[PDB]
Each structure stands twice: as structure tokens, then as C-alpha cells.
Design a protein around this ligand. Structure first.
Ligand SMILES: O=S(=O)(O)CCNc1ccccc1
Lengths: 275, 273
């Protein structure tokens, strides 16, 4: 009888993928007939860790926690949690907290592989804050794997760190176009920077995809809000939401989880940003 | 342990997120907790989100909605905690609120267009059923047109649904018109982007073949080629301000300015020749 309420925390208002996913979670939650409280942490552990105390105080029965750096410190406070909490689209390398994500490493590799097969030999990578695991530990690595496996060179200058803003993407293409030999394809860590990559390349006079093929990531709304429409790695937001809910529900009902660390499949939605 | 809840219709929408940014900033300044609720502008969900918020003992509420009905103010009057409407219109002004003159901002927009010698100017609006539209933006678009002696063409007023897609559709429709618009004023930036693309996709050039003026001036305004000329309604300020106004109430302070109205302007970019 007691209406169940789940807490959802996203790292920020910037990266629209998180917000969209939160929305995806809320959707699935509505059918369970659950309540949803959404908090924003601006990715500073403190607020994240306190939110874990603001969510209980606000009597939520469970939490879907999103984050770009679930440090071992997080893990500790987490395990101690009163209410069940599971991660959504967040790597937590120790595998000690229930989580559901896609295999980012494979996504990145498939994406660049995609371009290898198009005939590109020197492909650059514009990523997000390197300090975050999804980047330095998965996306950078799936990118490098793709190149080295195809016997391509791995230049340091071909991997540029941005800060998830559309502007960082622009500056990223400029730095890259100031390179000895330019890249013919650039894989970008998220759609918004990607949109910035397209644009900067388009303002310098380059044509997408005829001169520079670009693939983005997350497959957010921005994906189809550009010309040429952005082909992008798909991280199935509803799959994430659904799995995370049954998982969290099982927990709330004090059931058992045979698979606590679930990894959902991924695909690449191909559009006009690639030949 | 102060904590305020806020009801917007969609945090994932870059538009409502910029507002959330100011809400959140004054929030951390005052060391305050924030809780968001997504409405999807669905009335039934608004009432619900309102009850849930009260049920969670929030000390204040920032509310934003496409249509603040009369039943809304009624139930919103029963609130034991201060409620301040952000970027939402409600004529009676009996619920404090911070906004901008939407009728004037709209007018100014289509007006700039008139100046550049535009005669057949259209309007890609959102759900007309919404007050901000039928009673403010649409109105002002008709005023600029008439005060300047222009043919207010009923088929030059297309209703989209705030999605980037309806803006694409609306262009195609406007292009199917016997008399093609020489320019288009769009209600939101998201639809504006849709308008620019639809046009370009049919082979047209902005601003040389079609000038387009958006409204909101979100970051989406700079994420298009050509860059969108848009009416500025500083969502971040509205929200920062809405929080400070709410805070006074919550702390039982004085508010000699119950309904605040921030100023507006037009950011001209390359969407306007
Ligand atoms: O996730 S799948 O099982 O593949 C399709 C699920 N549809 C669904 C089921 C229960 C709740 C919400 C959505």
C-alpha cells in the first residue's frame, strides 16, 4: 500500500544525456507506480555523498545513482547505505555495487573500428574530462585498441580532452586541424561536443562527412538536431532504466540478485556524419 | 535543513535546465537543498507533483508551467509553504512570480523583422492552448503586424509542439503556402533550429532566403549554422531571482515586489541578414 518512492541523482544539468536518462528512469518508474525525486550533484563527491543522506531523510525507498567517478570512498559510504542503490551508466571498476551500463570500451572500439573500415587510417579522439573512468579507462582504451589492432599509429596529440560543453568541441577540432597531418575522422565522447566538432570543422571550410567523418556518443536528442545528422553510439536509455528498476525493486522487496552487475548491449545509430 | 522543491516540465530540455542552473546556484549560495520534479506539462501530474512536494516537507516551491489554470491558483493558494512561479504567466498576479514581458519580447522580435522590410512574416508557435502563446506571444506577433499595417495571415501562424521536429514540419507547411513568408518568428529555440534545418533541407538559405528569429536564447542558439538570432529571456536569472524571492518568504521577510519582471532584449546573430 505505502506508495514507494525512488531517488534519482544525476551529476549535472550540462550533459543532457544524464537528464534524458533520468527522464527515461522516471518513465519506467511511473508504470511501477513509484514516486521519483531527482537531485543534482554538480559532480562534487560531497554533495553526492550528502545526497545519500538527503535521499534517506527524504524517505526514499531506493536510489538510482548516476556519476562520473564512483571512487572507492563512494563505494564505502554506499555499501553502508540504508536504502538500496544501484548505478546507471556509471563505471565502478571494483564491481562491488549493483550497476547497469553498456560496455563503453567495446562501444568506443566499435565506433573507431567503424571508421577504420571506411578507410580512415588516422582518426582522432575528442573526449571528456580524462580524470573520469568512462574516459581514461574505457573510451580512450577502446579507441586505442581499435587503432593498434588495425596496426595504426597512436598519437598523443590525436586525443584531445574537452569538458563536455559544446564549445570545448569546437576548440577541439581547431587544435586537431592545427595538426601536422589532420585527422580524416574524429570520434567524440558525447553528442554535444560532437556537435561542436562538426561546426568548427564546418566553419573552417571542411565538409562532413566528405572531408571529416565524425561519430558521437550517447545518441541524445542533439543527434538529429544537426546537419549532417550525427551518427552516434547508442546507450539504450530505456533498457538502462528498466533493468535498473527491476534490480532496485528486487532490492527494495528484499529479494535476491543473481546478476548484480548487468551490462546491456549497445549499437551505433548511423546517420549523415559518416559516409 | 532547508530544502526547496521545484516543478518544471522537463529537466532534460536544455531550456528548463538553464533555469534550473540559477535555481541551483542561489541554492548552494544559501546552502540549500533542491529537489526536481518533471511534469511534461501534464496538468494531472502537476497537481500530483505538488502534493508529493508538500508530502516531503519542502519549505518552498518554485513552480513553472505552460498553463497555470484557475484551479491551479486555487490549490496553490492552499500551500503551507511559499510558492513562486518561474517563467510562467498567471494574470491575477496572486502567486508571486518572476518573468519577462512576453507580449513585448514577441513584438520586438517580429518588429525587428518588419524594419528589415519584411511583409510576409510567419509564426511557428507552440500549443496555442497555452496562455504564454495565445495571450502573449501570438498576441504581440499580431500587434507588430497590425500596428505596421500588415496582413495577419491565419495560415502564417503554425502550431508546433515545442519539439525540434514540429519546427521542421512547420517550415514545410509554410513553404507549401501560395504566398511564401519572407521571414519566420519562432516561439522556442528548439523549434527554431527545426525551422532553419527544414528550410536548408529544401534547399533554402538563412538569412538570405529566409530570416528566422527564435525566442529564449538558450545555448542551442549558438549550436546551429547559421547561429540563431533569438529573443533573450534569461532563464538563469529568472531562476536565481525566483529563489531569492522564495527565500525571503520562507524566512518571513518582506517582499515589496511580489511579482518581479526582468528585462529582455534580442541577441542578433546570423539567422538575421
Ligand atoms: O526491458 S525489456 O524487458 O527488454 C522490455 C521491457 N518493457 C518494460 C517492462 C517492465 C517495465 C518497464 C518496461
Amino acid at each position: 500500500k505505502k506508495t514507494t518512492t525512488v531517488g534519482v541523482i544525476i551529476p549535472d544539468i550540462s550533459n543532457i544525456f544524464y537528464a534524458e536518462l533520468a527522464r527515461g528512469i522516471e518513465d519506467i518508474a511511473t508504470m511501477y507506480k513509484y514516486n521519483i525525486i531527482l537531485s543534482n550533484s554538480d559532480q562534487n563527491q560531497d554533495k553526492e555523498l550528502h545526497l545519500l543522506n538527503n535521499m534517506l531523510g527524504k524517505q526514499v525507498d531506493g536510489i538510482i545513482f548516476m556519476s562520473g567517478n564512483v571512487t572507492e570512498e563512494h563505494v564505502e559510504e554506499l555499501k553502508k547505505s540504508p536504502v538500496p542503490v544501484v548505478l546507471a551508466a556509471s563505471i565502478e571498476s571494483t564491481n562491488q555495487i549493483p550497476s547497469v551500463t553498456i560496455d563503453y570500451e567495446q562501444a568506443a572500439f566499435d565506433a573507431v573500428q567503424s571508421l577504420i573500415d571506411s578507410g580512415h587510417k588516422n582518426i582522432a579522439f575528442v573526449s571528456g574530462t580524462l580524470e573520469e573512468p568512462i574516459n581514461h579507462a574505457k573510451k580512450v582504451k577502446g579507441y586505442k585498441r581499435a587503432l593498434t589492432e588495425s596496426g595504426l599509429p597512436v598519437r598523443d596529440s590525436y586525443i584531445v580532452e574537452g569538458d563536455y560543453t559544446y564549445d570545448s568541441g569546437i576548440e577541439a577540432v581547431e587544435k586537431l586541424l592545427e595538426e601536422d597531418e589532420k585527422p580524416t575522422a574524429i570520434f567524440v565522447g558525447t553528442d554535444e561536443m560532437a556537435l561542436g566538432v562538426i561546426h568548427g570543422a564546418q566553419d573552417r571550410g571542411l565538409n562532413v562527412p566528405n572531408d571529416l567523418e565524425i561519430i558521437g556518443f550517447d545518441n541524445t536528442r542533439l543527434s538529429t538536431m544537426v546537419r549532417p545528422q550525427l551518427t552516434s553510439v547508442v546507450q539504450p536509455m530505456y533498457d538502462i532504466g528498466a533493468v535498473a528498476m527491476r534490480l532496485l525493486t528486487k532490492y527494495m522487496n528484499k529479494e535476491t540478485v543473481d546478476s548484480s552487475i548487468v551490462q546491456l548491449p549497445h549499437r551505433i545509430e548511423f546517420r549523415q556524419s559518416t559516409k
